[PDB]
Amino acid sequence: EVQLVESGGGLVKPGGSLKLSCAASGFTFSSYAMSWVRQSPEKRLEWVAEISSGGRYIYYSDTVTGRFTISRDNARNILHLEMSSLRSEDTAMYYCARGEVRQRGFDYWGQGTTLTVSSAKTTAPSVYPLAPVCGDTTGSSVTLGCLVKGYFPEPVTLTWNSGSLSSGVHTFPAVLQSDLYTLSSSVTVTSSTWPSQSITCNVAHPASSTKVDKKIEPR
Amino acid sequence: ENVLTQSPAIMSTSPGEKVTMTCRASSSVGSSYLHWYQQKSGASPKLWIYSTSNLASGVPARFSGSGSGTSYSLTISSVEAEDAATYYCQQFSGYPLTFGSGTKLEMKRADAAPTVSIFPPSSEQLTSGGASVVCFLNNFYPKDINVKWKIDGSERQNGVLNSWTDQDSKDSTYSMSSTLTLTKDEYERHNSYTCEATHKTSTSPIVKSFNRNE
Amino acid sequence: DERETWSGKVDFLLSVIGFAVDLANVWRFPYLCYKNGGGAFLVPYGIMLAVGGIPLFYMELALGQHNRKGAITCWGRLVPLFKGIGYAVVLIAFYVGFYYNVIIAWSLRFFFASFTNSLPWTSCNNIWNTPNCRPFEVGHVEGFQSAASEYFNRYILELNRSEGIHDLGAIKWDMALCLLIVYLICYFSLWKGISTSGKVVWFTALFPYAVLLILLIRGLTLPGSFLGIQYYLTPNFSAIYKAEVWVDAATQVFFSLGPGFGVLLAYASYNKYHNNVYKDALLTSFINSATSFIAGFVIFSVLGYMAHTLGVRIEDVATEGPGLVFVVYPAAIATMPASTFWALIFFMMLATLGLDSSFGGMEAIITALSDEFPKIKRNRELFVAGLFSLYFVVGLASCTQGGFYFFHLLDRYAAGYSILVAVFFEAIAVSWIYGTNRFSEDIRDMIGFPPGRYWQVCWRFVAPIFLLFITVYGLIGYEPLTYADYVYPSWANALGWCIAGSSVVMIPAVAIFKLLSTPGSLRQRFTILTTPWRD
Numbered sequence: 001e002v003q004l005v006e007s008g009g010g011l012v013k014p015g016g017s018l019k020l021s022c023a024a025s026g027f028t029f030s031s032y033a034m035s036w037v038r039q040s041p042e043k044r045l046e047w048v049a050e051i052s053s054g055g056r057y058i059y060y061s062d063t064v065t066g067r068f069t070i071s072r073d074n075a076r077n078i079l080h081l082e083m084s085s086l087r088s089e090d091t092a093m094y095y096c097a098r099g100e101v102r103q104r105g106f107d108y109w110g111q112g113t114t115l116t117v118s119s120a121k122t123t124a125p126s127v128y129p130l131a132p133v134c135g136d137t138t139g140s141s142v143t144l145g146c147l148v149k150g151y152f153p154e155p156v157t158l159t160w161n162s163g164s165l166s167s168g169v170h171t172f173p174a175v176l177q178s179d180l181y182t183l184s185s186s187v188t189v190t191s192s193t194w195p196s197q198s199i200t201c202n203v204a205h206p207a208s209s210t211k212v213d214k215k216i217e218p219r
Numbered sequence: 220e221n222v223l224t225q226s227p228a229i230m231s232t233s234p235g236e237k238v239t240m241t242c243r244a245s246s247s248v249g250s251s252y253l254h255w256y257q258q259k260s261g262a263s264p265k266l267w268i269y270s271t272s273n274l275a276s277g278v279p280a281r282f283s284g285s286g287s288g289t290s291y292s293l294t295i296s297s298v299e300a301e302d303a304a305t306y307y308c309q310q311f312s313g314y315p316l317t318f319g320s321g322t323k324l325e326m327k328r329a330d331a332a333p334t335v336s337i338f339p340p341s342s343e344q345l346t347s348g349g350a351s352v353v354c355f356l357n358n359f360y361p362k363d364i365n366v367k368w369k370i371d372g373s374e375r376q377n378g379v380l381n382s383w384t385d386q387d388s389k390d391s392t393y394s395m396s397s398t399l400t401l402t403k404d405e406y407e408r409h410n411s412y413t414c415e416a417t418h419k420t421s422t423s424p425i426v427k428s429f430n431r432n433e
Numbered sequence: 434d435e436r437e438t439w440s441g442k443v444d445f446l447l448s449v450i451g452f453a454v455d456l457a458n459v460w461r462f463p464y465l466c467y468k469n470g471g472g473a474f475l476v477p478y479g480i481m482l483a484v485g486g487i488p489l490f491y492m493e494l495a496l497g498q499h500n501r502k503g504a505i506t507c508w509g510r511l512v513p514l515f516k517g518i519g520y521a522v523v524l525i526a527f528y529v530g531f532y533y534n535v536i537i538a539w540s541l542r543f544f545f546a547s548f549t550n551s552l553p554w555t556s557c558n559n560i561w562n563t564p565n566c567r568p569f570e571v572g573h574v575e576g577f578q579s580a581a582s583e584y585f586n587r588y589i590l591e592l593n594r595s596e597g598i599h600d601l602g603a604i605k606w607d608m609a610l611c612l613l614i615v616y617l618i619c620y621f622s623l624w625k626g627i628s629t630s631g632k633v634v635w636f637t638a639l640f641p642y643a644v645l646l647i648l649l650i651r652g653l654t655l656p657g658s659f660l661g662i663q664y665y666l667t668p669n670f671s672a673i674y675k676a677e678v679w680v681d682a683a684t685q686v687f688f689s690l691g692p693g694f695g696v697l698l699a700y701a702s703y704n705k706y707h708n709n710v711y712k713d714a715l716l717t718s719f720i721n722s723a724t725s726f727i728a729g730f731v732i733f734s735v736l737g738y739m740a741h742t743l744g745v746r747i748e749d750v751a752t753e754g755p756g757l758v759f760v761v762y763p764a765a766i767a768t769m770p771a772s773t774f775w776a777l778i779f780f781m782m783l784a785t786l787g788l789d790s791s792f793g794g795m796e797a798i799i800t801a802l803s804d805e806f807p808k809i810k811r812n813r814e815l816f817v818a819g820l821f822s823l824y825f826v827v828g829l830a831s832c833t834q835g836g837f838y839f840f841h842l843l844d845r846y847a848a849g850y851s852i853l854v855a856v857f858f859e860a861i862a863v864s865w866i867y868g869t870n871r872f873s874e875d876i877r878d879m880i881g882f883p884p885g886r887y888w889q890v891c892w893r894f895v896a897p898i899f900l901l902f903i904t905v906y907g908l909i910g911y912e913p914l915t916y917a918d919y920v921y922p923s924w925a926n927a928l929g930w931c932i933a934g935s936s937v938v939m940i941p942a943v944a945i946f947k948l949l950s951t952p953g954s955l956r957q958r959f960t961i962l963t964t965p966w967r968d
């Protein structure tokens with residue numbers, strides 16, 4: 001029924017300006033007040049702004065006040081947030097929610113769009129294979145790995161064999177160290193499967209237009 | 220600003236047990252204006268409880284809430300694995316609107332020893348000038364775990380990236396990725412590198428060591 | 434009749450100044466002013482300090498010098514019925530020594546770790562670090578610590594390897610060595626008694642002021658330094674309305690001046706009879722409170738520096754206790770140039786702040802037991818050896834992985850609110866049973882003049898009233914002990930109450946004991962117990 005989809009957002013440099021949009025459907029849009037809620041990388045929820053049903057009543061947080069401008073189009077059913085002079089602490093995932101009735105809270109949220117503000121610049125990731133030590137271990141199970149290092153910004157898409165085997169796969173979240181992300185992954189499978197079959201690590205980093213599929217060779 | 224502090228920050232619970240999280244406001248809040256939100260990992264938040272009492276649509280009867288003024292609480296009669304999430308209380312009484320600190324509910328299971336695997340630097344990386352040793356610790360409980368890095372009998376602390384995973388939706392165990400980064404030079408100067416698992420499951424550390432000899 | 438005295442007048446002053454001025458001056462008072470709305474907090478602090486704090490500080494130094502005996506024997510010769518007070522006061526200092534010296538050990542441990550240009554608490558790329566590690570100060574809680582926080586929690590303490598006080602874990606031997614070094618320093622200072630102890634405090638008491646001056650200049654020389662001073666002294670006077678701000682000022686004023694530990698009683702016992710205590714009491718009281726006020730600028734000048742250049746909320750960088758000195762402050766030090774220098778003198782100052790304070794605590798026990806048991810006096814070298822050995826062995830619990838949970842328990846229960854009831858009985862016993870007029874008659878014979886009626890009113894009325902009532906309102910706001918996200922078990926809270934009560938219960942304990950021991954009529958046995966030494 002009701003659906004909310006946040007668009008826009010991405011890497012912006014400090015002082016820059018960007019505007020985010022929220023697509024609304026499944027309900028009468030002019031009848032519900034909307035609000036923008038962002039979630040920091042530390043995962044704390046912070047209300048940004050609220051626009052009325054007619055858009056005649058606006059409220060902002062003291063943090064983003066005057067820098068951010070929340071607009072509304074009831075004709076095309078679109079919610080807008082126009083920012084300016086962005087700062088590094090403005091980095092979060094922005095959610096579109098309603099928001100109409102103050103006593104019942106926000107009953108609908110969107111998928112969300114991610115905004116990253118840093119002076120850092122985009123760089124393609126380097127995917128490396130993880131091959132177990134020569135000889136040595138022989139057992140019922142064996143663990144491989146794929147190391148995605150030195151990329152920015154998030155996110156990246158890592159799958160094994162085009163997403164054929166999702167079982168026994170641990171994909172660790174990236175960790176930002178000195179303006180660079182490092183993401184690894186581990187996959188465990190029976191020794192009868194490998195290397196009697198092809199095991200490849202699929203990594204995708206749309207920011208740099210990087211698509212890399214690479215098999216793990218025992219060499 | 221009206222601040223909402225939630226406790227506990229993190230809570231471990233066995234399925235079937237009852238759990239209660241508290242939300243306290245700096246300024247008084249109307250019992251009609253306070254709500255609760257449940258957010259599953261990597262997903263969008265969802266309205267859980269509104270007006271301090273009434274459950275939202277789809278929320279099982281196992282959930283409840285109460286309190287008034289500066290004190291409120293959410294309670295689950297019988298906890299289930301599907302109930303594991305981070306819960307956020309909120310107040311609409313006045314602007315600016317403020318979410319609470321949130322309570323992270325994690326399931327608790329039988330202790331499991333980590334399965335440790337060490338890997339040498341890839342050859343394609345060594346050509347790039349860098350060398351990074353990776354060590355995996357998978358499927359263990361609880362989450363807290365510690366890792367030394369030894370390029371020799373000696374230990375090396377600097378230049379290490381650890382990454383914890385989230386709670387497995389099945390076995391409820393965890394995994395850690397520890398990466399020791401070196402230059403293609405510094406790495407080739409030494410041979411035997413050692414990884415470890417220091418965990419509650421053992422008095423002895425779980426050791427994984429490889430040499431460049433093989 | 435023949436009892437050793439300070440080899441110099443300054444020996445006693447620096448010994449009392451050294452004992453009075455401690456980490457609490459840096460830890461709390463600056464923080465208290467921030468939360469309580471700045472120079473407006475000076476009012477309740479100053480009011481409670483004037484009526485409650487100083488008069489009792491004056492009373493112990495007076496009682497110690499006049500009766501010329503240790504804490505235990507002193508109350509035995511004053512009000513033999515209340516002699517249990519001397520036991521209650523001493524064994525409190527006995528408890529404190531357990532959890533207090535670990536702070537000095539932490540100071541040394543950070544001091545030892547302080548040789549490098551690259552400080553280990555700077556960035557997040559080390560092994561002890563977690564993916565949730567942040568550069569300076571996000572939140573908290575929850576879940577995301579800092580580089581200075583994770584270094585202290587996940588390495589130094591290794592508290593992350595402990596699930597609570599029930600699990601201590603393995604013993605850290607680098608801390609055990611540090612704790613040993615601490616007790617060793619305490620041992621060779623008190624080794625020969627106040628002979629060496631007197632001239633040792635010339636450093637431990639004075640040194641902190643040297644570093645205080647350096648860090649004061651360096652602190653006000655930094656960007657946004659004035660901004661921190663604002664959060665410090667900004668005068669919101671609406672804070673006086675709250676009930677807790679008065680109990681904090683009271684508990685701070687009492688813990689800062691350190692009456693009721695029997696230390697002032699011991700230290701003053703080595704004074705010459707005709708020496709002027711009233712002058713020493715006033716001077717010492719001022720220097721302590723002044724040191725706190727000064728330290729307030731030192732902390733917030735740096736705290737303001739973090740809220741400007743380091744891009745953090747002053748809300749999250751303002752803290753009391755070890756969290757400030759072992760995490761927040763070092764975090765600010767790590768950024769500024771010549772960081773290795775500031776870190777070294779800072780941690781050294783922390784150690785020199787706790788040492789001379791711990792000295793008084795130890796001496797309070799030794800002097801009190803020595804006057805009671807002459808067998809100890811001749812053997813004193815051997816006595817203090819075993820006592821500290823007990824402290825070290827038991828203190829090994831403080832050196833465990835869950836050691837901080839053990840520390841925070843004693844930091845809570847060991848001595849507090851008991852000192853209030855302990856000091857409450859000291860005031861009542863002196864002003865009522867022993868009597869004020871007889872006490873003022875003593876001071877007249879000593880310094881040449883009787884105490885002004887202002888002092889007598891505080892002793893007899895004000896102090897007991899501003900004690901009994903504030904000590905009561907502290908019990909109303911009582912929270913079962915919890916640290917961070919961890920909540921101490923119900924049995925743990927009970928163990929602390931035994932510790933806090935084991936002293937206070939000595940008051941009625943020895944009271945009833947000596948009451949039934951004395952041959953005579955009940956009223957006569959009462960009179961026997963209310964009569965002083967030669968009276």
Ligand SMILES: CC(C)CCC[C@@H](C)[C@H]1CC[C@H]2[C@@H]3CC=C4C[C@@H](OC(=O)CCC(=O)O)CC[C@]4(C)[C@H]3CC[C@]12C
Pocket residue numbers: 475479482483484487719722723726884885887
């Ligand atoms: C250093 C700052 C941050 C706080 C300092 C607080 C003082 C200014 C206040 C607290 C205690 C006060 C004193 C408490 C006791 C007395 C009462 C009164 O003493 C007498 O009656 C005369 C003395 C005598 O000869 O008996 C004269 C003021 C005086 C010294 C007060 C002077 C002002 C004092 C020092």
Ligand SMILES: CC(C)CCC[C@@H](C)[C@H]1CC[C@H]2[C@@H]3CC=C4C[C@@H](O)CC[C@]4(C)[C@H]3CC[C@]12C
Pocket residue numbers: 442443446447639642645646649720727
């Ligand atoms: C506040 C900071 C910056 C400056 C403090 C300077 C220090 C050196 C001052 C403050 C208090 C002073 C002490 C207070 C009074 C006495 C008693 C006297 O019989 C011996 C000197 C002695 C012990 C003083 C020595 C100098 C002293 C310690």
Ligand SMILES: OC[C@H]1O[C@H](O[C@H]2[C@H](O)[C@@H](O)[C@H](O)O[C@@H]2CO)[C@H](O)[C@@H](O)[C@@H]1O
Pocket residue numbers: 545546548549553607
């Ligand atoms: O662990 C051995 C000793 O050094 C430790 O770490 C120090 C030391 O210099 C080295 O490990 C490295 O440089 O990090 C720090 C500071 O440089 C600790 O100081 C203690 O464990 C020991 O004293």
Ligand SMILES: OC[C@H]1O[C@H](O[C@H]2[C@H](O)[C@@H](O)[C@H](O)O[C@@H]2CO)[C@H](O)[C@@H](O)[C@@H]1O
Pocket residue numbers: 548549550551
């Ligand atoms: O200890 C040697 C000097 O540098 C130290 O820090 C460095 C040093 O290379 C070594 O101790 C170890 O590797 O830790 C770091 C990084 O290499 C300290 O600064 C001091 O001990 C010395 O100045």
Ligand SMILES: OC[C@H]1O[C@H](O[C@H]2[C@H](O)[C@@H](O)[C@H](O)O[C@@H]2CO)[C@H](O)[C@@H](O)[C@@H]1O
Pocket residue numbers: 591603604605606
């Ligand atoms: O917790 C710090 C680590 O060392 C400590 O002390 C011991 C420990 O047995 C081990 O590191 C090593 O064998 O000796 C040191 C002292 O030399 C802890 O006891 C260990 O648990 C830790 O590994």
Ligand SMILES: OC[C@H]1O[C@H](O[C@H]2[C@H](O)[C@@H](O)[C@H](O)O[C@@H]2CO)[C@H](O)[C@@H](O)[C@@H]1O
Pocket residue numbers: 599600601602603604
């Ligand atoms: O009840 C707590 C358990 O551990 C504590 O710590 C000891 C204990 O001997 C054991 O855990 C481990 O082998 O050593 C540590 C100290 O090194 C208690 O002392 C034990 O009674 C318990 O087993």
Ligand SMILES: OC[C@H]1O[C@H](O[C@H]2[C@H](O)[C@@H](O)[C@H](O)O[C@@H]2CO)[C@H](O)[C@@H](O)[C@@H]1O
Pocket residue numbers: 680681684845846848849850851907908910911912933
């Ligand atoms: O509340 C009395 C108990 O704790 C006190 O310690 C602190 C603590 O912050 C809090 O309990 C209350 O505010 O009193 C002081 C600070 O004002 C006492 O020191 C303890 O003896 C009591 O158990």
Ligand SMILES: *[C@@H]1O[C@H](CO)[C@@H](O)[C@H](O)[C@H]1NC(C)=O
Pocket residue numbers: 550551770771772773774
């Ligand atoms: C440490 O290194 C930094 C950066 O080179 C330098 O600015 C600082 O002066 C050094 N400090 C010391 C104490 O050597």
Ligand SMILES: NCCc1ccc(Cl)c(Cl)c1
Pocket residue numbers: 452453455457525526527529530533688689690691694790791792793794795
């Ligand atoms: N905080 C000054 C009071 C104090 C300080 C340390 C000790 Cl060990 C004692 Cl008993 C008393």
Ligand SMILES: [Cl-]
Pocket residue numbers: 457458462685686689721722725
């Ligand atoms: Cl103070």
Ligand code: NA
Pocket residue numbers: 453454455457458688689690721
């Ligand atoms: Na003090």
Ligand code: NA
Pocket residue numbers: 450451452453454455456637638785786787788789790791
């Ligand atoms: Na001191």
